[PDB]
Design a protein around this ligand. Structure first.
Ligand SMILES: C[S@@+](CC[C@H](N)C(=O)[O-])C[C@H]1O[C@@H](n2cnc3c(N)ncnc32)[C@H](O)[C@@H]1O
Length: 240
């Protein structure tokens, strides 16, 4: 819709401009940041400079080899963090986006950024794509996960990740918009003890399916970082 206007803008840039920014993630991000729609507004829902910088710091510190984001929109975070993943040998970035129209646009921006060999966009519901990703990785656990899609799916999709044994000691979770609009359920979940999560999981049906009850035997450590806020959750071991 609106998003097609943005894609048209990029595709209609002069060749000299495309040649100038091609293969330069930071420059492609700036073209996204500086675009204005006819009504005067900008591209929405992008992770942005300040939160983005914080997360970039975590990636440089922890050097995740496998990073997954839930919710890609037009490719901004995939480009920002995929660029960081580039610097890490063997590193791969997976973006799980439900809207095919959005994903197609993100695919072009990611390619223009020079990140096509590093970033893979999976189209479909995150819960479905995670099942498929697990099949592809068995050939195991995720190193870092950026959770940035619909707030009501934070805990259901996290429980899917848990159930697929994609969370292990060393795995870091970064969840966006903890305050605005808010994800209180998620914030509650990742601050729960293993025993608390065991009861929650038995009590609260995963809307994604009975088979995705989750894994309570994970020890979590969570810090909220305020800027709005993001929750930073590390699995630090398996629970007794
Ligand atoms: C905040 S935007 C993601 C922004 C992106 N991470 C960035 O910073 O550039 C939320 C996105 O989640 C997507 N979404 C909603 N439900 C989803 C689901 N079940 N699985 C995957 N993506 C979903 C929407 O299509 C939307 O593009």
């Amino acid at each position: 819709e609106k998003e097609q206007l943005f894609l048209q803008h990029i595709q209609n840039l002069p060749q000299e401009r495309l040649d100038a920014i091609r293969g330069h993630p930071e420059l492609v991000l700036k073209e996204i940041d500086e675009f204005t729609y006819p009504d005067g507004s900008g591209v929405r829902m992008c992770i942005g400079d300040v939160k983005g910088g914080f997360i970039v710091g975590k990636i440089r510190e922890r050097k995740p080899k496998i990073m997954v984001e839930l919710g890609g929109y037009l490719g901004y975070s995939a480009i920002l963090f995929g660029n960081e993943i580039s610097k890490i040998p063997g590193g791969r970035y997976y973006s799980l986006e439900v809207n095919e129209d959005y994903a197609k646009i993100a695919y072009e921006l990611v390619k223009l950024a020079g990140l096509d060999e590093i970033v893979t966009i999976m189209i479909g519901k995150a819960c479905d794509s995670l099942v498929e990703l697990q099949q592809k990785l068995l050939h195991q656990a995720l190193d870092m996960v950026f959770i940035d899609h619909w707030k009501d799916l934070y805990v259901p999709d996290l429980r899917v990740i848990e159930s697929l044994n994609m969370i292990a000691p060393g795995t870091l979770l970064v969840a966006d918009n903890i305050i605005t609009p808010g994800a209180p359920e998620y914030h509650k979940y990742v601050n729960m003890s293993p025993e608390e999560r065991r009861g929650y999981q038995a009590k609260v049906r995963n809307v994604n399916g009975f088979d995705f009850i989750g894994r309570w035997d994970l020890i979590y450590k969570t810090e909220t970082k305020e800027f709005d806020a993001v929750d930073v959750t590390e699995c630090v071991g398996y629970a007794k």
